Amino acid sequence: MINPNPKRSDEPVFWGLFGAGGMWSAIIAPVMILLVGILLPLGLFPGDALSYERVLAFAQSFIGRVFLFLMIVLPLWCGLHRMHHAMHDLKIHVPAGKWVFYGLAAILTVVTLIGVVTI
Amino acid sequence: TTKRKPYVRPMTSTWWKKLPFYRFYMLREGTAVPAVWFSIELIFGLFALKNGPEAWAGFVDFLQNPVIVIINLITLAAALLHTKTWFELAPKAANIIVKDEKMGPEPIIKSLWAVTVVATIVILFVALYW
Amino acid sequence: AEMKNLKIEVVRYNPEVDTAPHSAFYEVPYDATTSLLDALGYIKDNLAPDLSYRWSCRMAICGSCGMMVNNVPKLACKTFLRDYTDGMKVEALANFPIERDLVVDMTHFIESLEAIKPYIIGNSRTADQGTNIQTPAQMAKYHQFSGCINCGLCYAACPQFGLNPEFIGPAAITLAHRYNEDSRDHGKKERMAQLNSQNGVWSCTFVGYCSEVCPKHVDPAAAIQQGKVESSKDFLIATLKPR
Amino acid sequence: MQTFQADLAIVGAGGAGLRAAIAAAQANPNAKIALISKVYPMRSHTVAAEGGSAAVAQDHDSFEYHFHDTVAGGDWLCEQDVVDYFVHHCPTEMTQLELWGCPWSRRPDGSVNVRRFGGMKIERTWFAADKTGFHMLHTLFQTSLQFPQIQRFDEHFVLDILVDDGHVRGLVAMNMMEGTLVQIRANAVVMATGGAGRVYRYNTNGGIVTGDGMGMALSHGVPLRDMEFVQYHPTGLPGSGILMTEGCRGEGGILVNKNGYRYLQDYGMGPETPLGEPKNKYMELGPRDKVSQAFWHEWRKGNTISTPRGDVVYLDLRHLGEKKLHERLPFICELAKAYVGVDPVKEPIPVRPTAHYTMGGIETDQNCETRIKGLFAVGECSSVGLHGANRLGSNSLAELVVFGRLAGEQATERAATAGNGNEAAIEAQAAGVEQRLKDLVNQDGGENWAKIRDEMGLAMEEGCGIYRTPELMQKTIDKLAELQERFKRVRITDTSSVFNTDLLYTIELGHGLNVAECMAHSAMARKESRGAHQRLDEGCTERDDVNFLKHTLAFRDADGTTRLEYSDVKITTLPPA
Ligand SMILES: Cc1cc2nc3c(=O)[nH]c(=O)nc-3n(C[C@H](O)[C@H](O)[C@H](O)COP(=O)(O)OP(=O)(O)OC[C@H]3O[C@@H](n4cnc5c(N)ncnc54)[C@H](O)[C@@H]3O)c2cc1C
Ligand SMILES: O=C(O)/C=C/C(=O)O
Ligand code: F3S
Ligand code: FES
């Protein structure tokens, strides 16, 4: 009927990340996409604000190093946890999807980490 | 030998197309994709930025591609969509009693939006005013 | 006066005779006060005595009239023909097995509710001592979550329960949550394993539709999310218990 | 039939039945208790109750006041040793429910609140907000889940009990989904099946309150007691007959005719009280009967507003304002909005009096036991002797837990001391049910039960209502005997086995007919007016204690006749004069 001694799901763990990640993309992603994806390429920024030279200064600041990391990393966790479940909802069987999606998240997190310790 | 022959209706993968309410949920969950895609683009940036002005500029030339622009508009639209639903969903996770009543989410939604507004502004100030 | 009729299509299904359910059609008179339940009874009285369906109260409180109406979960006793002039198709409550006509097998529901032990646990107070003290504020914690008439419209509405039939489900989770949030209950530990399961709160992807259909405005979606928070507090604490 | 063996078998899983199970489980941890119910326990009519449950809690109240209110409310047809036991046990059981998790409405200090009901001077009604029955029921059902002694037979329609040599040995029931027969053997049986208000065309009751339980008792020579006393509620929606809680009037709503006249000051319940300030016993808070009778008077006069669904007075709650409505009366507002289409905020609710509660029921002693040893009754299907000619508002919920408890324990003792019956005789009994069942299935004739149903309901409204006459009572008696005949000519066309409701509904109709006959007979013979039983004829318009201070007992013989005897009413400390 219903398992008497059912196993504790590991799900709290990913869902926690995805909570932190989701809140971040909610609050901060729109302005970021706006700056990076719209202003930067359309040169719709005043002077030399988004010049190669200026970015690097921020990128390479400690604050930037953390900010860029989280800007990249948190949305992946929220993002991919969502896609993990979208397979199920769409009824798509992916082998070790838990391994696939969270694995991908971990690969990227580490890469990003590497980037913000610099290459 | 029962005479019962329980008929079990099938649940297909087109199930969510039916109800408009299901469609929207799928859509809300769709925001995940461009979200992940923007994180991808950011990684290229972190690294073209790493590999010097040569690469960084070939990056900016990429964003400057008219299709990458359209993807990115959509991408930010998705983000607003996510933001919009996140703030409606998130509050149901709290149980706060004010004056003997369980508060609704509306106060919270307002705050998440206010803080989003400020943040959006402060970043734009910081990013652009120097 | 002359009463306008309505051609209602009800999906019939005898397991002795039928291979699969199939739709019949009935012409039913109505006015502005005529509920589906009224019309169901009418079909049964004068046209199809073999029409089998559940009901009792007629005021949407026993929670027994639950069925699909144009693909939305509803209480027949609270669904009105006037609201369906274009057409009305009546099916058995979705996500449950059809036993016969509009009667479905509630067992998992029932089994689910039972699994979370919805009763005060480990208060030792005895009646001769009089009652526990609970303040309007203390109640306001769970009160709404205690409004569940056990209809199961949540279960028809939840795509997650459809996909995974072992999901203990919105109501059951709500009901566990209701007891967990009672100042007078000391039994949270005894309901946690169910909720911590993957067949617990962790099957919900917050589709939310449950709470759209609750005819009693219980808002089971909120209870589940609050449950995820509790499940997540729980998991952490378990992780820090070396003992 | 498959045979199940239990120590106790309880028929009916409403407030009273659940409370009897729990008591039985607690009285003996080892016992196998068979809790049976044609519907799932949470669907029982107990769930619809909204006013509340009475239990003396306030410092100024006394058990003597609750005792007094009850006897007087009952016009002295109450069994005073029963009323005494009841008032004293009431506080215990409302507290136990609170212990069990019932969300009674609370005071700021966190103590439970009470409100006024049923015209009692001192407030003593606990309320779980506007859903007191919902809460009592679900609390009891859920609490019952913890006890593994109770084995429920959900959605099992009990057909008959088994009695040999003056003792009850079990019962035969149908698994409604499987369409199969089962036989539970138990040396004690409790009937907790609810009232019989569905023999009326218009009532407040669920479809399941059809008197099945009272019928079974008639079958075996147990009389139903005080059946003519059928409580009406003054304010029910037209057609549906859905209840508008008294609380509407506790909250100070008003009742008015087509001229918007608050007509009740003219029927002895004057003077009018200001809209803000409602006084108990005056106007809309006047005596229940008087208010129903008032509606009848207004009707004769041509003062009732005519509608498609019927003649009504209006229940005006407009002067309560949106806020007041929500905090104290939200459900009424949904009900009104939904079933009559009236936003109470902007509009007046049409109301009509509607059949509501069954004071009569299976005769029981003070332990809830009947004349058949081991056979017990509790709840609205019974006659403990609590309500006489008129139940008190909010006394029915209290009784369910007070006497449901008593019954559970008493039945448990009786089971413990029963000793064995004659096996061949018992299964001979069991085959009898099965045989008798096939008979009804093979029965032929082309009568639509639904019409007989309808026709029964009509005769009850017309001939057995608020005011009563010997013409109409006789017409109803006569109609009913005609319906009994026609009932033998009913063909049950559906032959399915899997949730076949045509057949179950047809059985319930059969019980109804039997029961109504008892009611109609009881009333015709009661040449007096007392409580709910009010007659217009010369020399019958007043209460009669020289001659009528006794309970009607109605027996039904094998020949299909309804015979009456009379029993004396027990007085302890409160005689009339
Ligand atoms: C709308 C409304 C509001 C009310 N409000 C109040 C109030 O505020 N305060 C108050 O004190 N009283 C109130 N009453 C009256 C009171 O609720 C009832 O008198 C009381 O609930 C009866 O409960 P019960 O245990 O006797 O049985 P019920 O609750 O009637 O349950 C009977 C049980 O019997 C079972 N059953 C019946 N037939 C069979 C069968 N053949 N086989 C198997 N099982 C069977 C059913 O399935 C059910 O589980 C109200 C009544 C109504 C209609
Ligand atoms: O709540 C009511 O109005 C009815 C009360 C009662 O029947 O006891
Ligand atoms: S629809 Fe299902 S996904 Fe959760 S929000 Fe309700 S239980
Ligand atoms: S009959 Fe009770 S829910 Fe509709």
Side-chain angles (χ1 to χ4, degrees):
Chain A
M1 60 175 282
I2 305 204
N3 185 323
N5 176 47
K7 188 215 309 201
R8 178 153 230 148
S9 179
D10 20 284
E11 270 294 308
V13 115
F14 304 125
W15 185 83
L17 293 171
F18 144 86
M23 188 90 341
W24 180 281
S25 50
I27 289 172
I28 292 173
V31 71
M32 287 305 286
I33 293 158
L34 170 64
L35 285 150
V36 165
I38 293 98
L39 309 178
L40 166 81
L42 303 188
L44 302 186
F45 58 95
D48 230 37
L50 299 197
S51 67
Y52 168 108
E53 293 79 23
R54 205 174 173 279
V55 187
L56 209 82
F58 172 65
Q60 287 178 127
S61 52
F62 178 49
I63 224 298
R65 269 162 186 329
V66 168
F67 177 89
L68 274 333
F69 178 78
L70 302 173
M71 189 61 237
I72 295 185
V73 157
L74 292 189
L76 282 163
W77 288 103
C78 174
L80 290 163
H81 175 92
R82 281 226 194 157
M83 314 193 185
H84 178 32
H85 285 105
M87 309 330 291
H88 191 279
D89 287 8
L90 292 162
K91 273 191 142 183
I92 296 316
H93 313 92
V94 316
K98 222 148 197 273
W99 290 92
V100 149
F101 287 98
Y102 299 112
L104 185 47
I107 289 159
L108 293 177
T109 312
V110 156
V111 174
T112 308
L113 174 46
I114 282 175
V116 304
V117 282
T118 54
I119 197 269
Chain B
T1 45
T2 156
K3 303 207 171 56
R4 302 208 278 149
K5 232 226 316 154
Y7 189 75
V8 168
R9 283 154 298 177
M11 171 89 168
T12 199
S13 56
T14 72
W15 68 262
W16 48 263
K17 309 184 162 186
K18 317 318 199 174
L19 233 293
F21 187 101
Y22 290 154
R23 289 167 141 280
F24 186 88
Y25 155 87
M26 289 306 278
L27 246 295
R28 175 252 282 166
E29 299 284 287
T31 61
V33 155
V36 159
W37 146 267
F38 186 65
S39 254
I40 291 321
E41 286 178 311
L42 290 195
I43 295 160
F44 297 169
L46 188 48
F47 281 89
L49 205 69
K50 270 290 54 185
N51 285 141
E54 284 328 57
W56 171 254
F59 183 101
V60 181
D61 192 15
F62 167 75
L63 302 173
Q64 191 155 338
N65 187 318
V67 183
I68 301 315
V69 182
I70 281 161
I71 300 188
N72 278 173
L73 295 170
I74 295 181
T75 296
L76 144 100
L80 299 178
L81 184 49
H82 163 76
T83 286
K84 205 285 205 115
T85 33
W86 198 261
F87 296 163
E88 310 164 336
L89 298 173
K92 324 249 40 52
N95 212 300
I96 310 99
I97 317 303
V98 296
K99 276 160 41 168
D100 292 358
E101 288 206 57
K102 185 151 74 84
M103 174 177 64
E106 314 75 3
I108 282 146
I109 303 178
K110 280 172 176 187
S111 318
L112 302 172
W113 269 110
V115 181
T116 297
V117 173
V118 184
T120 304
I121 282 169
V122 168
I123 285 153
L124 283 189
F125 180 58
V126 143
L128 289 186
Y129 275 55
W130 290 256
Chain C
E2 321 65 60
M3 258 173 46
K4 320 100 292 187
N5 269 43
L6 196 92
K7 181 89 168 163
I8 304 175
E9 142 192 29
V10 189
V11 175
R12 310 289 313 254
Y13 173 77
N14 186 6
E16 280 180 341
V17 165
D18 294 356
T19 146
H22 57 99
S23 320
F25 293 83
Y26 300 95
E27 279 238 299
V28 187
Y30 70 100
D31 53 48
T33 62
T34 297
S35 70
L36 170 53
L37 176 65
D38 283 336
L40 277 192
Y42 177 98
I43 297 326
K44 182 170 194 93
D45 274 1
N46 346 216
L47 328 168
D50 76 315
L51 185 47
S52 290
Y53 53 93
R54 295 175 170 121
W55 67 283
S56 197
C57 78
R58 322 169 284 120
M59 44 181 291
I61 192 61
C62 71
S64 55
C65 27
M67 65 202 57
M68 315 296 312
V69 199
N70 288 359
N71 272 281
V72 183
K74 317 191 75 66
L75 296 184
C77 67
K78 205 98 175 336
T79 298
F80 300 83
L81 301 217
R82 50 159 192 272
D83 281 322
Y84 292 74
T85 34
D86 292 16
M88 196 170 213
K89 188 196 192 220
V90 193
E91 276 178 81
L93 192 65
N95 298 335
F96 293 105
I98 312 185
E99 284 294 354
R100 156 86 187 263
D101 297 307
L102 305 167
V103 191
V104 301
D105 176 347
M106 294 312 269
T107 304
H108 178 68
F109 192 70
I110 299 306
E111 278 172 355
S112 280
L113 277 33
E114 300 179 331
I116 61 204
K117 314 260 203 81
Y119 38 84
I120 297 307
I121 288 166
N123 193 306
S124 63
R125 190 176 199 91
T126 42
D128 35 79
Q129 324 187 267
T131 79
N132 298 260
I133 309 289
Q134 201 173 234
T135 41
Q138 284 176 298
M139 267 193 43
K141 209 60 183 202
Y142 65 81
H143 191 242
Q144 179 184 28
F145 293 144
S146 70
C148 196
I149 76 194
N150 294 350
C151 55
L153 298 200
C154 2
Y155 289 70
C158 189
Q160 291 302 327
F161 172 62
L163 288 162
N164 168 21
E166 262 307 312
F167 177 30
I168 62 170
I173 282 168
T174 303
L175 215 74
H177 189 49
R178 168 275 177 272
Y179 272 91
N180 285 341
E181 297 291 273
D182 205 303
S183 85
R184 310 167 286 190
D185 174 75
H186 300 106
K188 201 179 188 212
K189 30 183 174 177
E190 339 288 339
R191 327 193 164 88
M192 286 319 293
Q194 283 316 143
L195 312 164
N196 296 338
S197 158
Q198 202 70 40
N199 287 325
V201 310
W202 297 118
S203 274
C204 199
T205 66
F206 209 151
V207 164
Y209 194 41
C210 21
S211 295
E212 273 284 328
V213 305
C214 211
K216 285 289 163 195
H217 310 100
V218 180
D219 197 6
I224 293 162
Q225 304 318 109
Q226 283 162 40
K228 300 195 184 161
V229 174
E230 225 55 30
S231 182
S232 299
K233 288 198 188 89
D234 193 51
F235 179 112
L236 197 96
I237 227 166
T239 275
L240 299 166
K241 91 201 166 189
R243 341 213 59 94
Chain D
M1 312 152 184
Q2 168 161 33
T3 288
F4 293 80
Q5 193 68 229
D7 289 341
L8 233 185
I10 303 179
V11 195
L18 283 168
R19 183 77 255 254
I22 296 170
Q26 293 189 288
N28 152 337
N30 303 326
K32 273 41 182 276
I33 292 150
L35 180 59
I36 304 137
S37 190
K38 52 187 172 166
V39 298
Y40 287 98
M42 65 273 300
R43 269 83 213 254
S44 312
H45 184 62
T46 313
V47 72
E50 281 143 340
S53 196
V56 170
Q58 302 191 82
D59 293 344
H60 49 135
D61 200 18
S62 176
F63 288 110
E64 169 64 26
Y65 304 147
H66 194 191
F67 171 92
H68 182 102
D69 287 348
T70 293
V71 160
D75 266 82
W76 273 268
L77 256 229
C78 309
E79 294 294 293
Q80 293 188 6
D81 56 348
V82 160
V83 177
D84 173 49
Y85 177 84
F86 168 75
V87 292
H88 279 284
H89 277 88
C90 273
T92 272
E93 286 306 322
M94 261 39 67
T95 288
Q96 189 49 234
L97 264 161
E98 190 284 320
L99 299 199
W100 280 334
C102 200
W104 297 115
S105 286
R106 299 273 187 164
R107 299 187 146 109
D109 46 61
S111 71
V112 303
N113 208 350
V114 292
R115 61 137 164 262
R116 205 185 278 107
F117 234 67
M120 313 174 185
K121 181 194 291 66
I122 310 301
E123 34 275 334
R124 80 180 36 110
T125 298
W126 308 28
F127 60 106
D130 252 29
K131 281 152 155 257
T132 307
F134 176 78
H135 290 288
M136 285 184 66
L137 188 62
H138 290 247
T139 302
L140 287 173
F141 179 55
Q142 291 163 180
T143 302
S144 90
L145 295 177
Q146 73 171 306
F147 303 97
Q149 290 76 334
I150 304 178
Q151 150 80 34
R152 291 193 272 114
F153 287 79
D154 290 333
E155 306 202 303
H156 272 65
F157 191 100
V158 176
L159 299 159
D160 206 340
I161 40 165
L162 312 170
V163 176
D164 186 48
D165 209 66
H167 219 266
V168 68
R169 293 298 172 191
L171 67 285
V172 179
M174 173 176 307
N175 185 304
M176 342 197 334
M177 204 65 82
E178 301 294 4
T180 68
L181 289 202
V182 191
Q183 134 173 212
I184 309 188
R185 290 306 188 78
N187 278 351
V189 161
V190 182
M191 293 261 73
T193 51
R198 284 256 102 182
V199 299
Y200 279 91
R201 187 202 205 184
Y202 306 114
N203 62 84
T204 59
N205 300 183
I208 61 180
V209 185
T210 34
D212 302 339
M214 285 169 187
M216 299 190 204
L218 280 184
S219 275
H220 296 257
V222 179
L224 300 189
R225 160 154 87 177
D226 289 340
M227 292 316 288
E228 71 267 50
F229 300 94
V230 176
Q231 182 166 108
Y232 269 72
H233 200 267
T235 54
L237 303 190
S240 73
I242 301 188
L243 182 62
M244 298 289 108
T245 178
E246 185 176 309
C248 286
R249 300 174 275 120
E251 290 310 308
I254 40 139
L255 281 157
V256 303
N257 62 29
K258 68 179 200 227
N259 312 327
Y261 184 56
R262 275 177 70 180
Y263 49 80
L264 302 156
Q265 60 200 289
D266 283 338
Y267 305 98
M269 298 170 290
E272 185 149 351
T273 53
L275 279 181
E277 282 103 286
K279 276 281 160 293
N280 185 259
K281 279 209 289 184
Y282 293 50
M283 291 301 286
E284 284 87 357
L285 286 188
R288 205 235 318 283
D289 319 81
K290 291 256 204 160
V291 184
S292 300
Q293 284 155 194
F295 167 88
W296 191 87
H297 295 300
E298 282 299 308
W299 172 69
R300 286 289 175 180
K301 286 189 186 168
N303 285 356
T304 53
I305 304 96
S306 210
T307 83
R309 269 154 315 183
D311 274 60
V312 302
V313 280
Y314 281 125
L315 164 67
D316 203 80
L317 300 153
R318 274 206 267 86
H319 52 277
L320 276 296
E322 311 196 281
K323 180 73 281 166
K324 277 196 174 207
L325 291 173
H326 229 100
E327 187 181 319
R328 286 158 201 210
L329 313 180
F331 198 24
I332 285 317
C333 323
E334 270 172 304
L335 286 165
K337 256 220 149 176
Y339 294 115
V340 287
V342 162
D343 190 344
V345 199
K346 149 178 205 59
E347 213 81 4
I349 316 160
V351 298
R352 182 182 187 93
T354 324
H356 176 53
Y357 178 88
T358 295
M359 265 81 86
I362 310 187
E363 170 191 66
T364 66
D365 75 14
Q366 302 98 323
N367 291 320
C368 290
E369 202 169 15
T370 83
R371 292 162 176 223
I372 293 158
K373 198 154 199 159
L375 179 70
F376 283 89
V378 71
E380 187 174 337
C381 80
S382 69
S383 189
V384 289
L386 179 49
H387 311 290
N390 247 334
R391 179 176 71 88
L392 234 63
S394 89
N395 266 10
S396 169
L397 301 173
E399 163 190 11
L400 306 169
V401 294
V402 181
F403 294 95
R405 194 209 178 110
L406 183 59
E409 290 160 2
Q410 291 300 113
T412 269
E413 285 171 21
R414 212 73 49 262
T417 61
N420 291 254
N422 178 314
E423 186 63 33
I426 311 176
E427 191 138 16
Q429 280 289 293
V433 182
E434 185 166 8
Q435 177 45 227
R436 217 178 307 115
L437 181 54
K438 305 193 208 85
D439 283 346
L440 173 80
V441 176
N442 292 326
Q443 163 159 349
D444 185 307
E447 288 283 339
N448 190 5
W449 80 282
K451 290 330 165 210
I452 300 175
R453 184 194 63 195
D454 280 340
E455 272 186 66
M456 177 187 52
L458 288 165
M460 302 312 287
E461 221 85 25
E462 206 209 358
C464 267
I466 296 160
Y467 280 111
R468 283 181 195 164
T469 66
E471 269 191 36
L472 312 170
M473 284 180 298
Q474 189 69 58
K475 191 182 157 184
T476 295
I477 281 161
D478 290 341
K479 191 26 159 277
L480 286 181
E482 167 196 314
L483 295 180
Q484 290 282 24
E485 287 161 14
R486 288 218 250 144
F487 186 75
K488 281 148 177 219
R489 271 146 58 200
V490 150
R491 211 245 138 148
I492 309 175
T493 69
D494 166 325
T495 58
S496 346
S497 309
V498 146
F499 224 87
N500 180 0
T501 70
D502 182 345
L503 171 67
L504 302 166
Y505 293 2
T506 301
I507 301 180
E508 294 158 358
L509 170 67
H511 287 308
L513 292 175
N514 296 2
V515 167
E517 283 188 336
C518 289
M519 306 187 156
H521 276 297
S522 282
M524 179 80 191
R526 186 164 274 271
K527 297 166 161 48
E528 78 153 343
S529 279
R530 194 186 219 96
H533 174 65
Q534 294 300 310
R535 308 181 43 152
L536 294 193
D537 38 327
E538 175 221 291
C540 284
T541 67
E542 337 247 44
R543 160 143 80 79
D544 200 316
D545 289 21
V546 182
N547 287 286
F548 281 97
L549 192 72
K550 51 209 182 167
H551 300 292
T552 312
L553 296 189
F555 293 81
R556 164 146 175 146
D557 283 342
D559 53 342
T561 24
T562 285
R563 294 182 192 264
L564 308 179
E565 311 188 353
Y566 286 104
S567 73
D568 274 319
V569 182
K570 167 90 191 199
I571 308 286
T572 47
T573 75
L574 192 60

